[PDB]
Every structure is written in C-alpha cells, then in structure tokens.
Ligand binder design. Structure first.
Ligand code: O
Lengths: 228, 203
C-alpha cells in the first residue's frame, strides 16, 4: 500500500520525543493490548503480515498521533470483523458498559494452563518465517539490480523511497514468507530474500551524503538484474 | 507538536481504556484470552527479556575472538550458545562497527526489532520522527538527537529492515578498558549502542 505509514524520507513530522527514562508499559491497557497478540494469533485472527496490513488501514491522522499499542487494538478489531469472530454491535455495547462502569469486573473464566504454555513456547522457541524452496536463488552478492516500480494497493514491503532505484546485492538470506501474498490472505508463497545496498545519492539526489548507504531487504520478485 | 484538533491526553486515555477493556471482555468470553496469559507476557518483557541479554553477547564477542567470528557468521546460532533466542529474533544478523564503518538500524515501514536480545523497542524507535529521518539524514540525526558525531569521512550504513531478518549492531569496545572483567564491560553496553544511535559508553 501507499499509506502514511511509509514514512522513510518524509519531512516535517517533528523532533524525536525520547523521555530520558520510560517503562516498558505506560499503562495497564498497554499490557492487555500487547498480550492480545498471541491470543488472537492462536485463534486464527491473523498472521504477522496480515497484522501489519490491519495497522496500515488506520485513519492516517490517528496513526500518526495515537499511542503505538492503540494501533494493535485497531488491527485486532479489523481482523475480528473480517473473520466474523468479533461482532461490532456487541463490542460497542461493551465499550459503553466499561465507559460507565470502569471498575466492573471482567467475565468469569478459567485460567487455562495450555494458553500460558503456548506463550512460553512462542517466546523462547520462536515462530521462524524461513522456508525451504525447490529452486536456487536467482541473484548473488555483487549483482547490480533495480527495484520494481509496482505500486500495489494491498500489503507489501515496497517503501516508496526505494521504488525504481538501482543497488547492489549484499547478501542472500534464504527463502522466507512473502509479505505481498501473506498479508493479503494469499498464503506464505515463500521467496528468496536479499539485502540490497542503495547509495544515499541514488536515493536522495545531490542532497545525498557521499559516504552513506541504505541496506534494504528485497524479496526476489522485487528486483531484476542490471549487471551480473 | 500542537494540533488544535486533538483532545487532551487524559480524555484519550479514558476512551482507549474503555475500548480495550471491552475487547478484552469479549476475547475472554470466547475462551481465547485470559488474565493469566496477559500477566505472563508482561512478566516476560518486563523482567526476563531485555537488553542485558544482548550486552552479554557483546561482551563475549569483545573478549573471545572465536565467539565473535561465530556471531558474525550466524547470529542466531551464536546467541543460542548462551541460551538466548526466540520470538522476534529467530533470524539475527549482527553487524560490526569499525574505525571505517558505522551501522544504524531502523524499520521505516513498521517496528521490526530483535526482542530476544533487546526486549521490546522504546517508543521513539517505533515513532514516525526517527523512522522518517534516519534513512535520509543519518549523520545529522545522530549528532542532533543523540549527540553522536560520526566524522564525514566515515561510512554510515543504515539497515532499513522490513523482513524477519533482525539486524543487531556490535559496537566497538571503548578505549581505556584493557583487561576489564566481563561484568565491568557489560556496564558500557546499552540498547542504544546495539541499535547504532550511540556508541558504547566511554570511560
Ligand atoms: O521495517
């Protein structure tokens, strides 16, 4: 997509806000929003690429200024509605209930140990996105390649500032889940992954530092050969 | 930044709190979320997983050339030697700062960050201000925001990471530390030094 979340090279967003010491969670609701990720993932609301696509569909002004974990809430609701797992009218009624009764209890429920075992296994075992494929990589270190000018409306990892630009392959990492399919409900469709180096002058013109480059991750369909 | 359209922080927090509690109540009734699940995730990322883990990796690299070689060859496998790994760091690649190269990491499209060695990202890393500028004016950003002057002849490599590869910066060992213990060296290693926005602590 071409939304306002694609900020690389944007100007005018303001100075960095870096409070000299900050807690991991700034309020109790942030802990809840954070932990809903494993719950909704296990229940089939979304995978990782779909999760990001939900955030990308936020109101742009809301995205730019709302607390980070509010973006997570928006994507849970987006995918809950998409999958039929969340009824919006019931959510709106419960929201008004907790507006009027902020200290009312949560529903009675069993503390099912398998859900905590799931958390521990995910955290310490991981959820690897690498996949084996049947063909070798098309490209290799040192190849000069050009990044696609395609501009899909669906999820992708094609920052506007690299589209159409020419760079050099730095490393081949193996094949991985492809965001352009996975984030749009089309499956993993794994593709070989590379890091490609683009000079600051290639990216930004003469306002470019002659001694800086950006290393950008390119799945195989993103790039085509210039010079072997 | 002043936006005349924006409600007070207190009103925003009040509304978010009610919407989150309402969603929480529905996921609880569906049987897919529990309060104990929430408490476990908070305990892990408040107390068990944080930048002290990455600091152990850095100091081993500083004090063991054979480990440093393994770390640069395969970051995931090397960190596993220390029992460090897992969610959001399944594919770590460590990059070495030198007298000739300085590395800095960003995710311009999202929030990719190596949780097993750093914990969850600080808010500034996830926010649009850092993300927009560091790919375009890294040398100026490091000086103005972080007080870190990288001389103009020294190459800056900005890793804009949208894949599941997780790039982690191995900062240079500060001068004046010959023969220090691993515990003493760890006091110089910060999360900022492993993102590349600051060097390891001097003195
Ligand atoms: O990213």
């Amino acid at each position: 997509m071409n939304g306002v979340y694609d900020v690389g090279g944007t100007d005018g967003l303001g100075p960095i806000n870096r409070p000299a010491d900050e807690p991991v969670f700034r309020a109790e609701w942030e802990k809840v929003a954070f932990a809903m990720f494993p719950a909704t993932f296990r229940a089939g609301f979304m995978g990782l690429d779909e999760f990001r696509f939900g955030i990308e569909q936020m109101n742009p002004a809301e995205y730019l200024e709302s607390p980070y974990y509010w973006h997570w809430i928006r994507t849970y609701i987006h995918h809950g509605v998409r999958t039929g797992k969340i009824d919006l009218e019931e959510l709106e009624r419960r929201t008004q209930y907790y507006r009027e009764n902020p200290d009312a209890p949560l529903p009675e429920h069993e503390q099912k140990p398998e859900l905590i075992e799931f958390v521990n296994q995910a955290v310490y075992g991981g959820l690897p996105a690498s996949r084996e494929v049947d063909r070798p990589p098309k490209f290799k270190e040192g190849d000069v390649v050009r990044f696609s000018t395609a501009s899909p409306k669906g999820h992708a990892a094609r920052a506007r500032y690299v589209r159409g630009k020419t760079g050099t392959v730095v490393k081949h990492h193996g094949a991985y889940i492809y965001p352009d399919t996975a984030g749009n409900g089309l499956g993993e469709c794994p593709e070989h992954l590379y890091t490609v180096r683009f000079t600051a002058q290639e990216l930004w013109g003469p306002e470019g530092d002659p001694n800086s480059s950006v290393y950008y991750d390119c799945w195989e369909p993103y790039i085509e050969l210039v010079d072997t | 930044t002043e936006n005349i359209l924006r409600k007070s922080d207190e009103e925003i927090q009040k509304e978010i709190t009610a919407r989150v509690k309402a969603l929480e109540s529905m996921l609880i009734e569906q049987g897919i979320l529990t309060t104990s699940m929430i408490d476990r995730m908070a305990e892990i990322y408040e107390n068990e997983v944080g930048p002290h883990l990455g600091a152990k990796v850095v100091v081993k690299a500083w004090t063991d050339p054979e480990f440093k070689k393994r770390l640069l060859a395969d970051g995931t496998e090397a960190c596993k030697e220390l029992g460090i790994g897992g969610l959001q760091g399944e594919d770590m690649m460590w990059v070495e700062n030198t007298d000739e190269v300085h590395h800095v990491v960003v995710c311009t499209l999202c929030s990719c960050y190596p949780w097993p060695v750093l914990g969850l990202p600080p808010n500034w890393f996830k926010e649009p201000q850092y993300r927009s500028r560091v790919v375009r004016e890294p040398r100026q950003l490091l000086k103005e925001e972080f007080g870190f002057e990288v001389p103009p002849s020294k190459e800056i490599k900005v890793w804009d990471s949208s894949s599941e590869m997780r790039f982690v910066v191995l900062p240079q060992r500060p001068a004046g530390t010959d023969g220090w213990s691993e515990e003493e060296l760890a006091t110089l290693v910060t999360r900022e030094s492993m993102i590349g926005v600051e060097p390891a602590k001097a003195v």
